[PDB]
Design a binder for this molecule. Structure first.
Ligand SMILES: NC(=O)c1ccc[n+]([C@@H]2O[C@H](COP(=O)([O-])OP(=O)(O)OC[C@H]3O[C@@H](n4cnc5c(N)ncnc54)[C@H](OP(=O)(O)O)[C@@H]3O)[C@@H](O)[C@H]2O)c1
Ligand SMILES: NC(=O)c1ccc[n+]([C@@H]2O[C@H](COP(=O)([O-])OP(=O)(O)OC[C@H]3O[C@@H](n4cnc5c(N)ncnc54)[C@H](OP(=O)(O)O)[C@@H]3O)[C@@H](O)[C@H]2O)c1
Ligand SMILES: CCc1nc(N)nc(N)c1OCCCOc1ccc(-c2c(N)nc(N)nc2CC)cc1
Ligand SMILES: CCc1nc(N)nc(N)c1OCCCOc1ccc(-c2c(N)nc(N)nc2CC)cc1
Ligand SMILES: O=c1ccn([C@H]2C[C@H](O)[C@@H](COP(=O)(O)O)O2)c(=O)[nH]1
Ligand SMILES: O=c1ccn([C@H]2C[C@H](O)[C@@H](COP(=O)(O)O)O2)c(=O)[nH]1
Lengths: 536, 537
């Protein structure tokens, strides 16, 4: 029998918040949360100058109506008020917000404007809008109007006013993933009182990434669907129902990190229980694909903390053609340490191999495929097939070749390697000045390996694109044996109930024109916002 | 404004049909159409003995009701008759069909049973059933009962007259893809009166494949729906007309696994990039697809055109023997490798010192001898190089949970010595619960011509490897790198995409063959292949 006001009059908040310039004390231990994005305004303007995409979203959300849904809404409203029963939306804003607009775009096209202003007078109005001087007076004005929905579009004070009074049903919130000077700030959203229910794809507009989330207020010929039921006539790990409460609560999960997370979910829900070489046990499945649009974001996972110095150094080490594990160890990159011990090599039957002499692994295959391996210190210059050089020449001079592959699975050399490669091969595709990369991965440790693997090959696709005068397009990651280790299950449960942030961007020094000239200083990850580190 | 009787009272048909024993004069080149599946009954019983899955579907469809939707139906029916004011479905059958049901299943459970008869009346039945002696009395009865939907469940005579009288809104039609003795038949459906709107996944049950299709009678407080619209705020190419894919796009549900292939073609046609390529023909192309075929349920031989497998089987056996001699295939009248072995082709690869049809260290050589020095096609390479094929077989048997069971043809060292570099780059195997899956990664994929054969090749191989390792085949998973449609294939493929698939065939292997090397051409049989007309691409 009971109903809320915001439910009856369909009152929503729509906003856009950036990150704010702070004082950098303890930035090595900087914590991020939803409040990280709170920057509304500066000098009576937006902290950013123009965002074409957030603008387009603003318009499309505040101007969209469905006239065939109105009859339901009008009935409820007139029945609530105890009254008898082109359509537009209402846009409520503060005075400062109304002032800071061009003359050409006032009043806001296809929308019913409402300005909350004490000082202003209705009679000396040049324009044709409505005016109120109280929050109480809005509900009055809505009762006397035919409107689809009512959007609170601005003013820090306005937002704050409506939020305290529980007059907002949903918050449409653009996260602008860049830092600007700010005068005014969106209030801290209470987690008990609102929850996120949907998250969009990640985009780039005007030199920043952004995404769109929706907070919802908490409370604590359409008969051919029978044919769909008939198709499901034949359908019906040890997982619990509430292990994935937050994960399953979301309606729309369009953020590209859900490609990784959904795969985890699928293995956890439907994986096959297996022993493996390690003796730890896994849940596994066979055959997935993920795709990341490198034109829009750098897909560094945000649901836990990832570090990249090590994987960049590894990549540079691959590109030099190195097999000497000591090079990495002397830079405190320990990714290959365990695979180079006396004991590990002996268990591989490599009894005559020096410690950290990893054998003819990735780097050797990329630069010297087919050369005879001796030891890690030998001179292999101009020996074997320099695959790396050949793919770069192919991309430059025969971009429509279907033969642009870099393969590390050298069958003849597998037993000489400290271990056989996981990243079997890379294929490249060029169209309209744009480079995409498929990497096939025979064995995928989803909890610990895959997050790094995505980052490495995404960085590498940038590197190859740049030195070939191309823009990066897609990194396409194909998983063969995809497995969650049992000792990662509880960490991943925690991770899957976290909501991703808009991704970072990768910056390469643009002076680097040849694949072999990159050094560690040439890589910058910007605007990395992430949840707390998890140890698997 | 005038309403149809079948629409008001929601009258449907539901049947299962098999194929029927016909003349042996033209079986080498048989013609197939929807009327291929027309076998209803034999000597008062089903032509096939039992089919658990068809019975389960029959049960599911004829018992399902949605109580929420009834209020609208009651209103609609009440309105038609000019009246103001657990739920079950009605099933209507012929007398003969009633008597074919065993006593313990009569009357049909959780359904209102109705029986058409002239020779028998209420007094002749002990059971809770309505008897009617004419079709019009069904309609009168439906006006009086509260029910969800009404399913005509056969009799050959009952189906025939109900279709003749235009009282069927949809036909739920099981295609049983095997042949049995029949004496009663489903009537030939008029293509002008009914069109297929949905095709299901393909299944195996009781030693036959089957699927389920739906013919439709032709015309001759929780709302986040707006949030979905918002997320779509940023949205929009190769001289494509709408009518090109009229049939393809008319279907509501395209769950038949053949649509994995057809949908990729569609996607390339609509959204592919125009590019030149090595051939000069040019292509539409896209990068990165995955298809999955369940080999436990069907053999995925494409049905929207005709394909023969003798060549590709001979090729696979040639691969397994480790051969590189093109003449061996030519002497079996298989010409798959003929163009790649001519003097002119070898010279154009700069293989001036290679004998005609000496293909160099291609697939077979890499499978049995990776890393060995290629000399010529007649050399004895025994115990040279890495016998990958034997290694994977040993790994599958002895270390099934290994994540290292890969066969790789892309030997970077040898590429230039190959008549041409391999397209099917590697196979990775996976073993769980006594069942074998295979991923194949294909770097370059000719959608019109190559891919249909490649699916078949690696599906066969998966079965061979499974058999010799005492496992059952599960999934063949096909990963496409550079996926292209050739420009000269476009019109042919537009034709193909407006054909509706048939239930897939099955592949049988000689169970005596226990070693990968012991297979011969006669150890393989394709059964129950129903296909559209061959298309010359
Ligand atoms: N999504 C976004 O990022 C977004 C959207 C819009 C604007 N902005 C930015 O934010 C800044 C403006 O925000 P702001 O909060 O400082 O200005 P504002 O809220 O737009 O304007 C404040 C004025 O609104 C009136 N008002 C507020 N609460 C009221 C109440 N309860 N009753 C009656 N009147 C009330 C008063 O007008 P009187 O002076 O008439 O009393 C008050 O001085 C600008 O820099 C603008 O560019 C950002
Ligand atoms: N594969 C399938 O989908 C399927 C489904 C159902 C049945 N079947 C098979 O089909 C066969 C039976 O088919 P059938 O054509 O021989 O018989 P049927 O159509 O079930 O029954 C015909 C009988 O029903 C009565 N009947 C039909 N129309 C009537 C009307 N307008 N008014 C009064 N009575 C009417 C007559 O009964 P009286 O003789 O009493 O007058 C007639 O002899 C069996 O082999 C059965 O196993 C197959
Ligand atoms: C777009 C920011 C914004 N974004 C979201 N998701 N929610 C909001 N409430 C919001 O705030 C609207 C407050 C209105 O503020 C503006 C800004 C830009 C403009 C302008 C401008 N300065 N110049 C041009 N040419 N066009 C326009 C669009 C007419 C006008 C009003
Ligand atoms: C199933 C074939 C069938 N399949 C489809 N798609 N449509 C039909 N109209 C149809 O025909 C039904 C008319 C024939 O009805 C029956 C009843 C019961 C049975 C039986 C049986 N003979 N034996 C057992 N054990 N169980 C059952 C089901 C408890 C078989 C056929
Ligand atoms: O870059 C890498 C390297 C290794 N692994 C994982 C996959 C397996 O969990 C393990 C290697 O084991 P084998 O598949 O080789 O048994 O390391 C990755 O996920 N990514
Ligand atoms: O099993 C095969 C063999 C070849 N091709 C096609 C793909 C390409 O169109 C062509 C090989 O040309 P390149 O990709 O090597 O350019 O042959 C296949 O689709 N499948």
């Amino acid at each position: 029998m009971m109903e809320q006001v915001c439910d009856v009059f369909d009152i929503y908040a729509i906003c856009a918040c950036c990150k704010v310039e702070s004082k950098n004390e303890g930035k090595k231990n900087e914590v991020f949360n939803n409040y990280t994005f709170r920057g509304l305004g500066n000098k009576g303007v937006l902290p950013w100058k123009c965002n074409s995409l957030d603008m387009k979203y603003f318009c499309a959300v505040t101007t969209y109506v469905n006239e065939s849904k109105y009859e339901k809404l009008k009935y409820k409203r007139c029945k609530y008020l105890n009254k008898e029963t082109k359509l537009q939306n209402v846009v409520v804003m503060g005075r400062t917000s109304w002032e800071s607009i061009p003359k050409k775009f006032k009043p806001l096209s296809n929308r019913i404007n409402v300005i909350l202003s004490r000082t202003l007078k209705k009679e000396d109005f040049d324009e044709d809008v409505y005016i109120i001087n109280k929050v109480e007076d809005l509900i009055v004005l809505l009762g006397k109007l035919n409107y689809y929905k009512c959007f609170i579009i601005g003013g820090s004070v306005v937002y704050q006013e409506f939020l305290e009074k529980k007059l907002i049903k949903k918050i449409y919130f653009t996260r602008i993933n860049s830092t600007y000077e700010c005068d005014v700030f969106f209030p801290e959203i209470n987690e008990n009182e609102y929850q996120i229910i949907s998250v969009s794809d990640v985009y780039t507009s005007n030199n920043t990434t952004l995404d769109f989330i929706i907070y919802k207020k908490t409370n604590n010929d359409d008969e051919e669907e029978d044919d769909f039921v008939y198709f499901n006539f034949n359908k019906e790990n040890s997982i619990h129902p509430n292990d994935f409460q937050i994960y399953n609560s979301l309606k729309y999960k369009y953020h590209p990190e859900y490609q990784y997370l959904n795969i985890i979910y699928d293995i956890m829900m439907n994986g096959n229980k297996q022993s493996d070489r390690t003796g730890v046990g896994v849940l596994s499945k066979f055959g997935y694909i993920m795709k990341f649009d490198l034109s829009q974001y750098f897909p560094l996972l945000t649901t836990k903390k990832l570090f990249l110095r090590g994987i960049i150094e590894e990549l540079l080490w691959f590109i030099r053609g190195e097999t000497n594990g000591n090079t990495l160890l002397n830079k405190n990159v320990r990714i290959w340490e365990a695979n180079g011990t006396r004991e590990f090599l002996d268990n591989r039957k490599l009894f005559h191999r020096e410690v950290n002499d990893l054998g003819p692994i990735y780097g050797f295959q990329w630069r010297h495929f087919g050369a005879e391996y001796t030891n890690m210190y030998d001179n292999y210059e101009n020996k074997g097939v320099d695959q790396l050089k050949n793919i770069i020449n192919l991309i430059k001079n025969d971009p429509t070749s279907r033969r642009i592959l870099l393969c590390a699975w050298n069958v003849k050399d597998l037993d000489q390697m400290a271990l056989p490669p996981c990243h079997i091969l890379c294929q490249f595709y060029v169209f309209d000045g744009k480079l995409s990369c498929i990497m096939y991965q025979r064995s995928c440790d989803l909890g610990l390996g895959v997050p790094f693997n995505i980052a490495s090959y995404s960085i590498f696709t940038h590197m190859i694109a740049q030195v070939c005068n191309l823009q990066p397009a897609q990194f396409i990651h194909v998983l063969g044996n995809a497995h969650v280790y049992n000792n990662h299950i509880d960490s991943l449960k925690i991770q899957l109930n976290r909501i991703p942030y808009p991704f970072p961007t990768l910056k390469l020094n643009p002076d680097i024109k040849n694949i072999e000239d990159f050094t560690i200083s040439d890589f910058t990850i910007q605007n990395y916002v992430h949840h707390e580190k998890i140890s698997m």
